[PDB]
Amino acid sequence: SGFRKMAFPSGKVEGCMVQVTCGTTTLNGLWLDDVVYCPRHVICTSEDMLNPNYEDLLIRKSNHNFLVQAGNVQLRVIGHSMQNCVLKLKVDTANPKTPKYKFVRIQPGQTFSVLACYNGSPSGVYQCAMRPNFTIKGSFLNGSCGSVGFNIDYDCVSFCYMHHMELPTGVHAGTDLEGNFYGPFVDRQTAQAAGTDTTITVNVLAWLYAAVINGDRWFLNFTTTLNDFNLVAMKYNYEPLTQDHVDILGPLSAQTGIAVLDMCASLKELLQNGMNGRTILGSALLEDEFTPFDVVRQCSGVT
Amino acid sequence: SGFRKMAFPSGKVEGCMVQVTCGTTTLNGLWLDDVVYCPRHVICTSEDMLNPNYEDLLIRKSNHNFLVQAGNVQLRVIGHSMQNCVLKLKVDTANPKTPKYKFVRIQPGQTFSVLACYNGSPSGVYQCAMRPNFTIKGSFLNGSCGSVGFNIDYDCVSFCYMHHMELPTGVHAGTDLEGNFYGPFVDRQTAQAAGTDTTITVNVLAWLYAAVINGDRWFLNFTTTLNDFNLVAMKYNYEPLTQDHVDILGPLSAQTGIAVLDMCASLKELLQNGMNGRTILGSALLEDEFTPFDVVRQCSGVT
Ligand SMILES: C[C@H]1CN(C(=O)Nc2cncc3ccccc23)Cc2ccccc2O1
Ligand SMILES: C[C@H]1CN(C(=O)Nc2cncc3ccccc23)Cc2ccccc2O1
After folding, report:
1. DSSP assignment of B47-65, as one string?
2. Ligand positioned closest to the Cα atom of B299
3. Between chain A and chain B, how many beta carbons pairs sit less than 8 Å apart?
4. What kind of fold does domain B201-300 have according to CATH?
5. Of A294, B23, B38, B238, which one is least surrounded by beta carbons within 10 A?
6. How many alpha carbons lie under 13 Å from residue B119 in its C-beta half-sphere?
7. Chain B residues close to A119, C-beta within 8 Å
8. Which ligand is nearest to the Cα of residue A39, counting in written order?
9. CA of A137 to the centre of ligand 1 (A)
10. Crosslink Glycyl lysine isopeptide (Lys-Gly) (interchain with G-Cter in ubiquitin) sits at which residues (chains A, B)?
11. Is the minimum CB–CB distance between A303 and chain B shorter than 8 Å?
C-alpha cells in the first residue's frame, strides 16, 4: 500500500535527449528517427527574445549553423523547417534508441512525467498536471528548454509536452510536439497573463478514492446532486463535474463501494469546513494532480 | 524556478531489473555483472513466512529451482548463496547493461529514488527519504519486493535500498544490497514495532532555504541559540540539530545571505505558531524529504 506521486520510468525517453546549439544559445532537443525536435527560440539571442520575427531570423540560418550533439556523438544536420513553435532538424543518422512513440496533445487536467534536462543530459524526473489554464507548476532552470513531458502506455511513449518558457509568475508554458502552445502563450518575452486557474475536480475525487483504498477514511459521511455540488464547486474555483467525469470514476466507485455522489458530498463539506488541521494521505491540502487512471495505475501496479 | 520532489533518471537502473521465480513465489531482482540480487524470502511459501528457517529452507533448493527472467531472456543459474537477507544467484551471462555502480548504506534522513517494479518490469519512480526510524513511507504492492532504491552520482549508480516487506502500519522496510536490514526488522510476518519517528530537522531547514530561493519568504523574521532551538525541536519531535548539520547548510546560508541560526529562529516560530492557513512552496506542512544536497542539486540543475 501507500500512495506517492509517481512518474513513469524515464529510460526510453533518456535515449532521445540531445544537445542543440545554434549561435550561442543551447537548449535540449528530442531525437526520434532521423529528426531532432527542439524549441524554435534557439535561433534567438537575448535581444531577439523581446519580439523575434522567427521567419526572418531562421532565413539567416543554415544547416551547419546547427550543432546537434548526442552525448559525445555529434550529428550532421541535413535539413531544417519550422513547424509552428518547434524546429525540425533532419539528420543523417537515425536514432538507434528510438522507442515506439506517438505525438499526442493532452487536455487540461491530464497528467504526465517530465524529464528535466540540461545540455541534453537528464537531471531528474517528476509527475505534474496540465493546469486548466494550460500551464504547469514545474521545476525548470535556464537551459531546461526542450525537455519533454510524456506518458508511457505499455512500451509506447506518448510525447505530449515540450517546455519552452517561464512566465514572470514563475510557472511554465510549452507546446505539443507539433509546435502549438498549450494556452494563449507566444514564445516571446513580454507580459503574458495566464487565466484564472481552477482545481481539477475529477482529480481530487480520484485522490479521495485512493485514500479510502489506503485506509484514511475520516472524510466520509450525506449525498448531493451533481447540480448542487457544482454550485459548491463554482464558489471554490473548482472546475465543474460533468457526467463523463462521473463515468470515469465508475471503477473507483465499484471497488470502493462508494457512489460518486456520496464522495462529492464528502468533498463539498471538505470545501465548506476545511480540514480542521488533519491530513489525507499525508497532505494537508486537496491534491489534484492524480487522474482517475493514475490512481488505478498505482493501486493496480501496471507496468 | 519552481521546486518539485524530483527523482533521479531511472534509465540505468531499468536495465538491471529481472524477474526471479522460485517455487511459486515471484519477486524482483537486480542483475549486475553475472550476479542477481533479490530478497531471500522468495524461497518461502505463505506458511513459511510466519517463522521461516532460511538455512533449512534454502538447503532444500537447487540452482534449477531458480527461474531468472531478463525480459524475454531467461538466465541460467549456476550458483547461489545467502548473504544476510539477500540471495546472490550467479548466472552464466554477465549483464551487458551493467552501469558503473557501488553498494552503499545510507544514514537516516538521506534520500533516494525508488524504481517500483513488478515481475521485473518497471512501473514508476518516486523520491523518498529514509525515516529516522529506518522505514520509508513508500508505494509498494504485493510483488514490489526486490525493487531498489538508489542515487546517481554522475553516471555512477549507488544502490542503497532493496525493498523486502510491508509493516502492519502500512509503511515499508528493507535492507542494503548486502542484506542487512535498516532498523530492527526481520524478514518474517510478525508484529514489528517501528520506533518513534522524528522529523529530519536538517531537511526542513534546507527546504526553507529552497523556498527563499524561489520567492516565498513570509516565514522569515529573531535569532536563537543552537541549544535553545534544539529544546524547541525536542518538544516537537524534531531530531536535534548538530554543528555538522549547520556546516552542511553553509552554502545555502551563503547563497541566501541568511544565517543558519536565523532560519532556525524562523522555523521555531513555525513550530510554535503553526502556519495560519498559508503554504510554503505549495505545501501546507513542513517538508523533510529534501536534503541540503537535494536542494542545491535542483537549484543548480546538476546532470
Ligand atoms: C528568454 C526567452 C527564453 N526563455 C528561457 O530561457 N526560459 C526559461 C525556462 N526555464 C527556466 C527558466 C528560468 C529562469 C529564466 C528563464 C527560464 C523563456 C523565457 C522565460 C522567462 C522570460 C523570457 C523568456 O524568453
Ligand atoms: C508475506 C511476507 C512477504 N512480504 C510481502 O509480500 N510484502 C509486501 C511488499 N510490498 C507490498 C505489499 C502489499 C500488501 C501485502 C504485502 C506487501 C512482506 C510482508 C508484508 C506484510 C506482511 C507480511 C510480509 O511477509
Report:
1. TGGGS--HHHHHHT--GGG
2. 1
3. 144
4. main proteinase (3clpro) structure, domain 3 (1.10.1840)
5. B23
6. 6
7. 303
8. 1
9. 14
10. 5, 90
11. yes
